[PDB]
Amino acid sequence: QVQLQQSGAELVKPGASVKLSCTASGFNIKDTYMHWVKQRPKQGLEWIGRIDPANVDTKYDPKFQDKATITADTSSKTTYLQLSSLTSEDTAVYYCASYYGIYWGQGTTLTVSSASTKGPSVFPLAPSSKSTSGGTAALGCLVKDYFPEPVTVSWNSGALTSGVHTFPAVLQSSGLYSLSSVVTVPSSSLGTQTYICNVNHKPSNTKVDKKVEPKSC
Amino acid sequence: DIQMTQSPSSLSASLGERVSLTCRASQEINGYLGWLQQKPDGTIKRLIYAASTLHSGVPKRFSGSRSGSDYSLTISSLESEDFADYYCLQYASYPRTFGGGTKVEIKRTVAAPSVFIFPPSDEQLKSGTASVVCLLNNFYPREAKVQWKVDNALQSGNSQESVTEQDSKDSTYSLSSTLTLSKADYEKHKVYACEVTHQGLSSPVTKSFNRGEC
């Protein structure tokens, strides 16, 4: 069908600029002109600006003038969101929308950080604390100090899905990320079932498997 | 620049409930308002344009109204796929402005949290950092309270809470609170407790362990 293709995730250093694109399939920018919207992690939608290539017009919210620059290539049915002098305040998701906001693109994630690609450090959230089987136990994996996002946590290579909780990542003071994937399991299985967490982090090409076993802690 | 004041911010309703979202304009945007919806994980969809004109294919259980400056979005029968975010987009003048947004969550009975606490692993201590986590599984409503206490000393500015998204199946929530010390500080303290407060609990429960590296 006719939709809006958007550029890939971007990881830039504070200071530089970025250029995000959005291509229309079928409908062109002449008829269906574009809008660019921002959305910081877990925040609302902020209108940045828009462009009407037909009239060679361009609008911007006062808060984005000069800092954002939208240009549209008529032949390619592609607009471009240019963002300069990037700081942490720019790390967000940006969506493009056409005339009347009829179609919206998947949005491209921009991450502004001084940090670099780092593999995660997976540690076991061991069970049997103040217990020894009986009832329901809980264990998991601590995925910490990795960059950028994200991480994919599977349990027993996809075999264990029920009761798994992979919490959203938390940005730490070191600029690195961290998260946990806890799993609710019967206490009776704690010595007769091996629980392995399969942590994957493409950016660093890290693939690890951590075995969580009971400890009398 | 016209400002859209959206209300409410949060809303918890039950399936088949009649809900209404409101968005008041500062200046006269006369009819030029749209309603959008953003499903969990990103997807945004234009529901209504022109204050009450439903986008083709949008269920008839959605309608738009206007009373002076206040523009409302109303959902007759709140079906499960209506659990998403709504925003009002003004387009009478430039710049276009949005509304703060409304998060409509599923309502359900009070569920007391299941609490667990995990001491840091030996291998991690070797790297200095000592992470401690407290897990509050499947509870509702989301309003929780994790007070980390080392040797009864209340901890502050040294923990990070992370909340899972409302579960599709049982509509509950899960919270992980991570406390972070240094192998130096950590090894100089014995009892590490976690005190959780939830309306589904009569008294604040606590989970703790003694520093006894295993």
Q: Which domains are seen in chain A, by residue range? A: 1-114 (2.60.40.10), 115-214 (2.60.40.10)
Same domain, residue pair B75 and B170: no
DSSP state for residue B2 in the 8-state scheme: -
Q: B198 with B147: CB under 8 angstroms?
A: no
Residue B70 Cα, gap to closest chain A Cα (Å): 20
Residues comprising chain A, all counted: 217
Same domain, residue pair B99 and B171: no
Q: Do B162 and A167 touch (CB under 8 A)?
A: yes
Q: Which residues contact B7 (CB under 8 A, 6 or more apart)?
A: B21, B22, B23, B24, B100, B102
Same domain, residue pair B125 and B50: no
Q: Do B176 and A62 touch (CB under 8 A)?
A: no
Same domain, residue pair B120 and B68: no
Q: Which residues contact B8 (CB under 8 A, 6 or more apart)?
A: B21, B102
| Nearest Cα to Cα of residue A217 among A108, A118, A113, A129 | A129
Same domain, residue pair B15 and B99: yes
Q: Do A125 and B164 touch (CB under 8 A)?
A: no
Using left for φ > 0, alpha for ψ between -120 and 50, and beta otherwise, residue A67 falls in: alpha
DSSP state for residue B72 in the 8-state scheme: E
Looking at the structure of chain B, the number of domains it has is 2
Q: Which residue from A minimizes the CA distance to B130? A: A123
Same domain, residue pair B188 and B160: yes
Q: Do A101 and B36 touch (CB under 8 A)?
A: yes
How many Cβ contacts (< 8 angstroms) between chains A and B? 124
The CATH number of the domain holding residue B92 is 2.60.40.10
Rounded Cα distance, A192 and B203, in Å: 36
Structure tokens belonging to residue B78: 């709140």
Same domain, residue pair B101 and B115: no
Range of the domain at B129: 109-211
Cα three-residue angle A37-A39-A45, rounded to 5 degrees? 65
B130–A contact, CB cutoff 8 A: no
Q: Do B94 and A59 touch (CB under 8 A)?
A: yes
Longest dimension (CA), chain B: 69
| First-to-final CA distance of chain B | 62
Q: Do A61 and B137 touch (CB under 8 A)?
A: no
A136–B contact, CB cutoff 8 A: yes
Tell me the three state secondary structure of residue B113.
coil
A124–B contact, CB cutoff 8 A: yes
Instruction: Mark the breaks in chain A: residue after which each occurs, C to N over 2.5 Å.
Output: none
Q: B73 with B35: CB under 8 angstroms?
A: yes
Q: A28 with A3: CB under 8 angstroms?
A: no
Same domain, residue pair B8 and B30: yes
Rounded Cα distance, B67 and A52, in Å: 32
Q: Given B108, B132, B157, which residue is the final one in a domain?
A: B108
Rounded Cα distance, A77 and A2, in Å: 12
Structure tokens belonging to residue B136: 């509050």
Structure tokens belonging to residue B33: 């308002």
Same domain, residue pair B145 and B72: no
Q: Which residue from B minimizes the CA distance to A180? A: B176
Q: Given B87, B108, B129, which residue is the final one in a domain?
A: B108
B120–A contact, CB cutoff 8 A: yes
Same domain, residue pair B4 and B100: yes
Q: Which residues contact B101 (CB under 8 A, 6 or more apart)?
A: A44, A45, B6, B9, B85, B86, B87
Mutate to test the interface with A, among B87, B170, B176 (most CBs of A within 10 A): B176
Q: Which residues of B touch A107 (CB under 8 A)?
A: 42, 44
Same domain, residue pair B32 and B103: yes
B47–A contact, CB cutoff 8 A: no
Q: Which residue from A minimizes the CA distance to B212? A: A217
Q: Which residues of B touch A179 (CB under 8 A)?
A: 162
Q: Which residues of A touch B53 (CB under 8 A)?
A: none
DSSP state for residue B184 in the 8-state scheme: H
Q: Starting from the edge strand earliest in sequence, which strands make up the sheet with A35-39, in order?
A: A10-12, A108-112, A92-97, A35-39, A46-52, A57-60
B164–A contact, CB cutoff 8 A: yes
| B119 → closest Cβ in A104, A106, A129 | A129
Q: Which helix (H) or strand (E) holds B175?
A: strand B173-182
A40–B contact, CB cutoff 8 A: no
Rounded Cα distance, A96 and A106, in Å: 8
Q: A181 with A165: CB under 8 angstroms?
A: yes
Residue A85 Cα, gap to closest chain B Cα (Å): 22
Q: Given B49, B80, B108, which residue is the final one in a domain?
A: B108
| B174 → closest Cβ in A61, A165, A215 | A165
Q: Which residues of A touch B135 (CB under 8 A)?
A: 125, 138, 140, 180, 182
DSSP state for residue B170 in the 8-state scheme: T
Structure tokens belonging to residue B26: 């500062």
Same domain, residue pair B57 and B127: no
Rounded Cα distance, B35 and B103, in Å: 14
Q: Do A47 and B123 touch (CB under 8 A)?
A: no
| Full DSSP string of chain A | ---EEEPPPEEE-TT--EEEEEEESSS-TTTS--EEEEE-TT---EEEEEEETTTTEEEE-TTTTTTEEEEEEGGGTEEEEEE-S--GGG-EEEEEE-GGG--B---EEEEE-S---B--EEEEE---TT--SSSEEEEEEEEEEEBSS--EEEEGGGT--TTEEEPPPEE-TTS-EEEEEEEEEEGGGTTTS-EEEEEEEGGGTEEEEEEE-----
Burial A170-204 (b: 16+ CB within 10 A, else e): bbeeeebbbbbbbbbbebeebeeeebebbbbbebe
Q: Do A47 and B98 touch (CB under 8 A)?
A: yes
Q: Which residue from B minimizes the CA distance to A140? A: B118
Q: Do B178 and A46 touch (CB under 8 A)?
A: no
